[PDB]
Amino acid sequence: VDDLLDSLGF
Amino acid sequence: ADKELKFLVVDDFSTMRRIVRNLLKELGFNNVEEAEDGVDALNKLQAGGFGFIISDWNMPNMDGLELLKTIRADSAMSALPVLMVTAEAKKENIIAAAQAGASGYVVKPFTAATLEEKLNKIFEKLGM
Ligand code: BEF
Ligand SMILES: [Mg+2]
């Protein structure tokens, strides 16, 4: 989840 | 961002709105109004002047995703920053948020420090 948020810039 | 930027805090739970409003105040953002769902939010946005939206995900009548899409599809409001707040992060909702144009996405609860960090990321991206 956090890697997704981080990858998306959130 | 201008300290007087007018925020609209949208959430169907009054206490959560109060908390977000207080966190904003702690950061120096005093110009804040509230809405209890997407319909109510759109109604108050019609009054103009708003510069930032913080919206909850699950709300009756019109939820946060629905509100976000409505804003992004409107010629006068399409550029408004919108920070989504949610009780639970699910990959599917995050991807949905990105597709609809969310400026940010944060899981509650969060501290003032976290709010400040998310706001600044958005300000920086948008040159505010
Ligand atoms: F109802 Be919100 F998505 F926490
Ligand atoms: Mg809710």
Q: Domain map of chain B by residue range?
A: 1-128
d(CA B64, CA B12) in angstroms, rounded, equals 10
d(CA B7, CA B31) in angstroms, rounded, equals 6
Phi, psi dihedral angles at B86 (to 5 degrees): -145, 150
Question: Helix or strand or coil: residue B9?
Answer: strand
- Using a CB-CB cut-off of 8 Å, the residues of chain A touching B98 are 8, 10
Please answer whether residues B4 and B31 qualify as being in contact, where contact means their C-beta atoms are separated by less than 8 angstroms. Answer: yes
The experimental method behind these coordinates is X-ray
Residue B40's nearest CA partner among B19, B16, B66, B18 is B66
- Experimental resolution (Å): 2.0
Helix orientation angle between B112-126 and B14-27, rounded to the nearest 10 degrees: 70
Please answer whether residues B8 and B54 qualify as being in contact, where contact means their C-beta atoms are separated by less than 8 angstroms. Answer: yes
d(CA B50, CA B112) in angstroms, rounded, equals 21
Residue with tokens 């953002």: B29
Residue B40's H or E segment, with its range, is: helix B38-45
Q: Is the CATH number of domain B1-128 3.40.1190.20? A: no
Burial B11-25 (b: 16+ CB within 10 A, else e): bbeeebbebbbebbe
Among B94, B114, B121, B125, most A C-beta atoms within 10 A, so best to mutate, is B94
Q: Which residues contact B55 (CB under 8 A, 6 or more apart)?
A: B9, B10, B11, B38, B41, B64, B67, B68, B82, B83, B84, B85
Q: Which ligand is nearest to the CA of B110?
A: 1
Q: Which amino acid is at B40?
A: D
For residue B125, how far is its CA from the centre of ligand 2 (angstroms)?
Answer: 27
